[PDB]
Amino acid sequence: HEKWFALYEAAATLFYTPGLVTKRSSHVRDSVDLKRIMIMVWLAVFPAMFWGMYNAGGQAIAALNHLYSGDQLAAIVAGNWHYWLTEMLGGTMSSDAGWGSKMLLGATYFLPIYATVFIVGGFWEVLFCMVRKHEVNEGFFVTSILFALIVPPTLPLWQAALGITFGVVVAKEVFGGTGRNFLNPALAGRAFLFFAYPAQISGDLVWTAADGYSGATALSQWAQGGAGALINNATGQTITWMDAFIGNIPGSIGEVSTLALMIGAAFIVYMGIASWRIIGGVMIGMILLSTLFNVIGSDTNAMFNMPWHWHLVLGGFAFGMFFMATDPVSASFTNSGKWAYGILIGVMCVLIRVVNPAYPEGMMLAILFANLFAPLFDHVVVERNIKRRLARYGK
Amino acid sequence: LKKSVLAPVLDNNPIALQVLGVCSALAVTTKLETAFVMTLAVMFVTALSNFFVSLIRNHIPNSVRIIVQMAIIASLVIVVDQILKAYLYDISKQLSVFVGLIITNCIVMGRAEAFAMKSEPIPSFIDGIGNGLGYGFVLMTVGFFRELLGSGKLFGLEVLPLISNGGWYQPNGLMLLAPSAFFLIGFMIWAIRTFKPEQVEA
Amino acid sequence: EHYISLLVKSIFIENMALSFFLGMCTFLAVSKKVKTSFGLGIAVIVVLTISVPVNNLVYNLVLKPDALVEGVDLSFLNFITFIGVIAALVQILEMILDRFFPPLYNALGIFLPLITVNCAIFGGVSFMVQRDYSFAESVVYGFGSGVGWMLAIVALAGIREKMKYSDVPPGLRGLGITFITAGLMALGFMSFSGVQL
Amino acid sequence: PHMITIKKGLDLPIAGTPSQVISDGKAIKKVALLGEEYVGMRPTMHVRVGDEVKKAQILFEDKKNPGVKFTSPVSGKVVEINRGAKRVLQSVVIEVAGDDQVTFDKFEANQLASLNRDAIKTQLVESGLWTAFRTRPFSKVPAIDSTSEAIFVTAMDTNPLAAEPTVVINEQSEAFVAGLDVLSALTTGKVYVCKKGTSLPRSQQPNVEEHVFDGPHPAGLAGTHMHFLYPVSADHVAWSINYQDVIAVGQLFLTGELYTQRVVSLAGPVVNKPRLVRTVMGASLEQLVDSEIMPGEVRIISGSVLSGTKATGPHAYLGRYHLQVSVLREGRDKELFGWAMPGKNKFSVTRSFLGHLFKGQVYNMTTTTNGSDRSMVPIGNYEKVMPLDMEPTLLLRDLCAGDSDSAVRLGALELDEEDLALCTFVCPGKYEYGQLLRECLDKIEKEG
Amino acid sequence: STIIFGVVMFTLIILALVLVILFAKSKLVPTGDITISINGDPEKAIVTQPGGKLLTALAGAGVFVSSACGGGGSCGQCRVKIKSGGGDILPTELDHISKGEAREGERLACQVAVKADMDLELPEEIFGVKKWECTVISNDNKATFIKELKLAIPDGESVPFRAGGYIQIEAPAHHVKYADFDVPEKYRGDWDKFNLFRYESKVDEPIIRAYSMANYPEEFGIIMLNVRIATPPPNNPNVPPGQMSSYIWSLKAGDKCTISGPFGEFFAKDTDAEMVFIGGGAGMAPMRSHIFDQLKRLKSKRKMSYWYGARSKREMFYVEDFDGLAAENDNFVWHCALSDPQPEDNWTGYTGFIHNVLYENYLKDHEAPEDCEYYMCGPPMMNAAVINMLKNLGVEEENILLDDF
Amino acid sequence: SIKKTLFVVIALSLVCSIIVSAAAVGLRDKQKENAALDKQSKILQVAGIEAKGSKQIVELFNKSIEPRLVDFNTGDFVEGDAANYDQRKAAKEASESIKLTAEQDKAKIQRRANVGVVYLVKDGDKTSKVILPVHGNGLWSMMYAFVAVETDGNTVSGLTYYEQGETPGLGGEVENPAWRAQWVGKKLFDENHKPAIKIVKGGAPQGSEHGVDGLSGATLTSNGVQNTFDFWLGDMGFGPFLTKVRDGGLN
Ligand SMILES: Cc1cc2nc3c(=O)[nH]c(=O)nc-3n(C[C@H](O)[C@H](O)[C@H](O)COP(=O)(O)OP(=O)(O)OC[C@H]3O[C@@H](n4cnc5c(N)ncnc54)[C@H](O)[C@@H]3O)c2cc1C
Ligand SMILES: CCCCCCCCCCCCCCCCCC(=O)OC[C@H](COP(=O)(O)OCCN)OC(=O)CCCCCCCCCCCCCCCCC
Ligand SMILES: NC(=O)C1=CN([C@@H]2O[C@H](COP(=O)(O)OP(=O)(O)OC[C@H]3O[C@@H](n4cnc5c(N)ncnc54)[C@H](O)[C@@H]3O)[C@@H](O)[C@H]2O)C=CC1
Ligand code: NA
Ligand code: NA
């Protein structure tokens, strides 16, 4: 029964810490390990996940009540299992629906995607580990949760499975696994979906989980017209900066609320898991490019007048900066490299947001570009260090 | 001679073991018909260039060997381009600049210099035919996968009904972009070297 | 201005190595070391900058339809004219460097034989002809395409150097993993597709 | 003097600190010389089991380093010659008995500074004190014919549970000054005495220069001192010696006899009365720590916990460059969801554990790895503990990948295994970077 | 028509390109002769046009260097300290030249290509390497598949040799048949057991090969040698026989054969440590050379052991000589082991693999094996086994002398 | 031996140039015919005449399709070689083209050719419709199409996009047969004779005369199509020609 030894070892180590002792120098070791690091990152996104489920349910219910009423709404509820299951479990689908019903609908829409991505990615990881006679790394939990939190609520399960398969096998496993790749696996899977099935991950019919509802998101609305165009058609109210900051807007499950993401990011940064230098660089680049665009101005491209705070609260900027750009493996391994990496991420994200009409948001593409170019930053820093060493550090 | 001419297909692939003729493999592989026409053109050009170089291998001055070989290759490619414009105009338009880039294709020049220069005309012709056959095998595999999974079609014939035409299959847009060819070639090399471990690099 | 936009487009938006798969053989062969990749990129930059304008001048003077003489178009000599011009330029540059500038030949002249008939130069010239460019426009386009190719090769070299710590399965080690890395790089570079600069 | 402050490092707050008071200590009947602690040392034996040896008598020579003699710290009968796998000399053990000893020339305290370099080298080699010197790069015993223009005297000890060098040196100030004078005569360049702020006996020679180093543990390492004062490379080689060996050199050149007495801090979480004790070089630790450790399964370590040798079996003897005995508990226990519980009584460089909230806490650290072996994920722990001007993440990745050329370019030649001990401690992947560095240095030396 | 204009333009473009290339070559490429300096000696200098290899240039000049593999960067014995010039070091060269040696300036002569002025320093010992035309003396079979051949220099500048060295011999195109081989009845029975005479060789290309010597220094103007016929492997007899081996076996008394000068560094250290010799088959030649040099020319008192591994009794030679030497001096002890003795052998002594028997008999009870100098020479597999055994016994590479090549 | 090298190179160049020039000159006519027939097939397809095979395509195009040149500024027919005309080259040339201001350039096309080419579908001594080539910038590339307009000048018989580079599935649906067929019967201009064709998001009202369902999830391409039609139905486009045709310009 040695074939399933990897799975048995993974389960045993998950339940109990191993009793291994040191064998060489440094007979004492730090208490922190990959398990704790990955679990801390995984828990840091729990507030974002819960608010995302709540917001998805609330937006879906509002759109449903804005589009249908009475027997037509009942027919829609009966036609959708996401709706009649919520009704069955005590969650009303009416306008006077509580936070509990909204969270239940969000769960019905999110948990299937999370389960599918987790199962498929874990199967691929286990297959690779068993075939190559390795142990199971702990980063898959973070990869799966982050992938599940950056997709529209209405994503097909087969599409989610294909995306996670690509992100896990093509970007990580073929490179040896966790800690041995250069690209972000979750963002690689999301980009695979982006460029393979755009119709399901873009437009106006995917960011709100309501049947027959068409509504643009904040970035698209700002692109069309400008700041005055930000209106929530479901409720007919202007989208305020406070609304976007708290996360009461359509979009991906885990991206909407900047406040919850800020809380989780603050916790992980205080614990030292996430590099604050990368976050600072991202903020510096975003602010600089946004201010430059505002100063230059434009009479045709409304995005040119988007303030830095609006850039911060709109789209998946906060989620990317806090959890996707801080991936230690895909970032620079030097402090100066981290600064340059963050600055490049921010600049590229703002540039794709503004001067690229095809894509309303560009945080994922910017992070992929920065992942490609980070080794060059660390190489430049290392070459400077080597020159200093050859100079005997000025001695 | 069958083994000698079939060796380039798998034993010594121009794209899977040698790094040659990758531009056309990555670009033209969008459609199976274009891949097939490119395969035929490369086979013909390589075979004819090898044959002529072997015919006048002894009389070629060394100081202008590269120019003499490139002149023959360019003349053959120009003739092929004119032929593809006269017939198969749509395929020629789809191929675009890569028909002309066949001249700079590494396979043709490498075979001409390594084999045709110091080999008899008929063996050089056979070597060119085999190298083109292997290049075409790689191109055909990649293009078949790309076209099938990106359009539900083979040689323009529907094989998978698309949803847009009242079908059941949603085409994979990424199969019509650059990364698809890269990934397909990488995994094809993986499979080839898994079935032939002797080619595994260190 | 127009030239700045053209340079930016030819560097980022129009990237030869990944967008058009031009020069991929040397791209995947010489990307092992960052210094070697930088030298090869500089060589490609200089060769493209010295070839595209000469090819533009030759095309305008002779190969253009009806330019040389009324009712006569020699567009069927495009390929041989361009490839021969490039072959002559690369060889003469490699020889003059080896003669007068030994350090320059050692730094860059080593790679010129690989650029003599490289696909990147021919593809750039072919795209320039298929488009409409002046002499200055051709110079800027050649320089920008060379810079973009250098950027792509240097990024690939950096990634490959970083991958010294990776554990690639046998059979995928080397050419296959390089191909997968190039595909991921193309994915990352697709960010500029929608820009119409 | 000239003060250099280190901001990046880690002072391990391990429980059981020494009392910093010198005690008589137990009686040692077995004294051993460990053959595996000398880098690149292939021994040609000069004694056999049952042979009678005097103090400062050669037991074996070095094939790879001709002229280097390893002498007996004590006079008595050779009882064991322990050879491990591939007949690697694990240790040569001598039962102590008698007073017979070898003697050498002696000089007045006012002549040592003017002694000839050749005479000093001859006396040191004959007495065996030459092996006290270690060459950076490669941390090997210097060649007899070789010379260096920088001798680093480590008069400070920042290792956890380490004795205070000031207390030891105050007893032997005259010997320390004599050793400093001898080192000043021997060195072609300068003698950098690296110390803490507290005063120490001072030599009058212009060559000897006192340098004060402040900060956490890495401040006390000869590697850090070399990096900050005399950067080393293939073309520039420095020598390293500790204050106890300097006292021994001074005693040798003052009295004509080898000085083998040492003061070692016996301290640890499982030590009833941690304190400094007098002992002899190569003393048997099973007898040194006898009737002084709490019951249970424990590990005795010669050297600090960060960098030391597990004193078990043939290696159960005090090392040549170790001035400390650390006794720790064996952490073989398994607990349910231990990696998830709040970090009360858990120490970490990161703030992921509750322990860091309670300042001044002391942890009864064990030998547990606190996790399985995983790939290296650079969360930034190495930079927090590496003070040297280097890229620790990239250097450690090169060491893991076995890229000797890149490691040398990144500064692997200025490092010893003790320099990467904190990196090993803080690594979440549980890499032992000392072994990787030693392998890289061995490959570099063999190739060059 | 446009055909004429197109043809004219094509011809003009091609002619312009060719003329530009020719003019660039004429005005940039230097055609001057390249000068190679040896030890900075004007008398010992070479002039040659660019091209070829440095080894070929040196051979044409007259100075010879070890070419055991005959080029291709395999043996690596060709080593020249190029102080300046010669270009960088190739990856194939790096396979045998370490980083320290490369920094010192060592390069492979057969791999380095001469194109410009280069200065290299070569030890004066190389000037002692000369090419001679020796005469055959005896070609009597000495075993079933091992023969002793004695080539004598015609008193022409016979440079003294060193024990343990080897020479290099070139055989031009020729044709030989196994029938011409000389085999007394004792070995001819085994030879005809499988009708090994059915084989024949036809060399269509001169071949250069390096063979060890078998004569101690006290022997003047004599080059003894041992040759093992490279018979086709029993598993695949269809493969052709050994070119050089068959040619040497087909030689006749009085025939003139070309030989090169002394080569190799397989010399004994000038110490007093115990010596252990591990020979087998053709290794008997160098082992005998070393033993006779140490016991006759020097008459050293060091303890010496010689373990020889023969496939069968019929493969044992020089037994009487070694027994007489051991009787004369007890400091030398010999012990031969038969790995695969035939039933007719009736051997009663040591059997099995030489390394295993040596380890079980002597090294197991030896107090300080690391202090013993182990010289060995035999098949590659035997060398690997002995090296592995010695390493397991903690013997360093310095004390182990082997012809790695 | 420089003479031998010169002889061999010049002889090889002579033979290669002879064969290359022979092939090129021989195949020039066939290549021109192939390109012409490729254009003719699409023109006939938009006209609504079924044609299979090169011979049938040529015969039907010669019988029915009548090319003509129209000056945009005046809207009157202009004499010239309509069949062998390249409006793209004419637009590229500054002398034969006009630069457009930002307000004028609704379709984001830099230059407008002074003289365009239209095709009259002759039913026999009578025109049944006029096919106009329009084009405008899309999200990724420039999209070209043929619009067939009845003799009244206010009805769309058919539309086809014969050159586009939009993303398949999202932006490529302009080539969808259903989307193209939906265009039949629409009114280019309203009662006031102004651009009235509209692309409406989320479908169009049933029975609408000027509303066309947009491209799902492709609002940018739909906007490009809207801008193309708005420009090419205005004064700077075929507005004057269509106005003339409405009053019996063709008949
Ligand atoms: C420094 C030095 C010293 C040496 N000293 C001696 C010495 O003292 N005595 C001595 O005998 N040798 C000595 N050698 C070895 C010698 O140089 C030759 O390598 C050896 O004698 C074989 O010569 P050959 O002509 O048979 O070689 P080759 O022609 O290279 O090999 C012939 C052998 O290869 C087999 N073979 C070839 N191809 C195949 C195939 N496809 N399948 C199966 N079998 C195949 C043939 O059947 C035959 O057995 C020495 C070598 C060196 C470098
Ligand atoms: C596809 C197959 C099925 C799987 C998909 C998911 C659906 C099934 C499982 C859902 C889990 C919850 C089970 C049902 C709870 C029902 C609770 C209840 O009493 O009813 C709803 C109630 C709110 O009621 P109220 O708003 O007052 O309205 C009542 C009438 N109007 O509710 C409340 O008071 C609030 C209860 C909210 C519960 C849903 C949110 C759960 C989110 C946590 C999931 C996290 C798991 C992943 C993370 C990692 C886990 C290790
Ligand atoms: N470099 C030099 O100067 C010389 C090199 N040689 C090498 O030695 C070879 C000897 O060949 P033959 O005479 O045919 O040898 P052989 O067939 O007579 O065998 C000689 C010995 O090798 C031993 N042996 C073989 N395989 C072994 C294994 N796997 N493990 C342990 N012992 C093993 C046998 O037991 C025997 O004792 C030459 O062909 C050449 O390669 C020989 C003489 C000089
Ligand atoms: Na938000
Ligand atoms: Na955008």
Author numbering:
A (entry chain B): 20 to 414
B (entry chain D): 7 to 208
C (entry chain E): 2 to 198
D (entry chain A): -1 to 446
E (entry chain F): 2 to 406
F (entry chain C): 7 to 257
What do the authors of the reporting publication say about this deposited model?
In the human pathogen Vibrio cholerae, the sodium-pumping NADH:quinone oxidoreductase (Na+-NQR) generates a sodium gradient by a so far unknown mechanism. Na+-NQR is composed of three integral membrane subunits, NqrB, NqrD, and NqrE, and three hydrophilic subunits, NqrA, NqrC, and NqrF. The six subunits NqrA, B, C, D, E, and F of Na+-NQR harbor a unique set of cofactors that shuttle the electrons from NADH twice across the membrane to quinone. Here we show that ion pumping in Na+-NQR is driven by large conformational changes coupling electron transfer to ion translocation.
We have determined the cryo-EM structure of Na+-NQR in the presence of NADH and UQ-2 at resolution of 2.86 Å, which was improved by density modification to 2.55 Å. The bound NADH is clearly visible in the map, and the nicotinamide is Π-stacked parallel to the isoalloxazine of the FAD for efficient hydride transfer. Structural information on reduced Na+-NQR was obtained by a cryo-EM sample with a fivefold excess of NADH over UQ-2, which presumably results in the reduction of most redox cofactors. Nevertheless, in this structure, NqrC resides at NqrB, like in the oxidized state. Minor changes are observed for NqrF, which exhibits less flexibility and in which the ferredoxin-like domain moved 2 Å closer to the FNR-like domain of NqrF than in the oxidized state. It appears that it is not possible to induce certain conformations by a certain redox state at thermodynamic equilibrium. In the cryo-EM structures, FMNNqrC resides in close proximity to FMNNqrB at a distance of 5.7 Å, compatible with very fast electron transfer. In the cryo-EM structure, FMNNqrC resides at a distance of 27.3 Å from [2Fe-2S]NqrD-E.
